[PDB]
Amino acid sequence: MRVVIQRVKGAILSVRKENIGENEKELEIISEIKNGLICFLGIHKNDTWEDALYIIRKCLNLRLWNNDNKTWDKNVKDLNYELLIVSQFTLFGNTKKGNKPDFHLAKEPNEALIFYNKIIDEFKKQYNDDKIKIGKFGNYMNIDVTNDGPVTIYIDTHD
Amino acid sequence: MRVVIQRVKGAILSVRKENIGENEKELEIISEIKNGLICFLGIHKNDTWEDALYIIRKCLNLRLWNNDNKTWDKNVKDLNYELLIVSQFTLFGNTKKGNKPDFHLAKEPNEALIFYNKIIDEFKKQYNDDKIKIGKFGNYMNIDVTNDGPVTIYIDTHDIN
What we know:
Two copies of one chain form a homodimer.
Chain A: E1 2-16, E2 27-33, E3 36-42, H1 49-61, E4 65-67, E5 70-74, E6 82-87, H2 109-126, E7 132-134, E8 141-156
Parallel strand pairs in A: 3-6, 6-7
Antiparallel strand pairs in A: 1-2, 1-3, 1-8, 4-5
Helix pairs in contact in A: 1-2
């Protein structure tokens, strides 16, 4: 699996309004976190529940916040902060050959969904139902993110 | 090098201003883009100018926009869009150790700056210097990003050729 974790003061997720379009730009806010993390999650074709659990563990316990001058001290749970998990098949976009990326390594959208949703369940089980916000799987999204630092971390469980 | 490219409608980069009022913003905007890419760039201790060139070529030539009737069609240059380049040593945060990440694989700050600055110059050379915006290298920053998609591309040049 792959994830880009970013440390935020806020993120606001939006999807396109229903009916309108597909020429037409108008959005509905559907998710909102304050301080916390936004986790861009790419699920690989051969991802087992092991990969998932590793990602969840790291998102929840990685110590990405200062305590005064003390760097890398607090995790998201210590601070009662929020996570916003967003599915990102593009993390597996092969760019080695040519300028048109292709995403062959990413798990298939339908298997991806149940796998993803299992992950969201587990996030909620390992932390709190109230702290896990999500996007709209497979849907185009607008996310206004306040990057704090920035702090961007990258994890690939196939390493 | 490692890079995290994100497709944006806009990005706005601030730093903490020092001596402040009551009542008066802590943060001051120093840098701004509209449509384009934010590129969070990680410079490894053993990075060469070949690593840097790859990154630059990809950022500028990756086709991450739809030209109506075709997906993954156009790059930043085609659309006359902008790149915001921000050094990100945390991309070499090793996280297997414990829950405390370490970054010993990242190039030291003073030589990373020299390298970063050459890259910013080469960005401006290969494209337009009006289109390349930057942050404040060793400084804390607030960056309000409008993610478009979102689309998040990851490249580590130590994977390619």
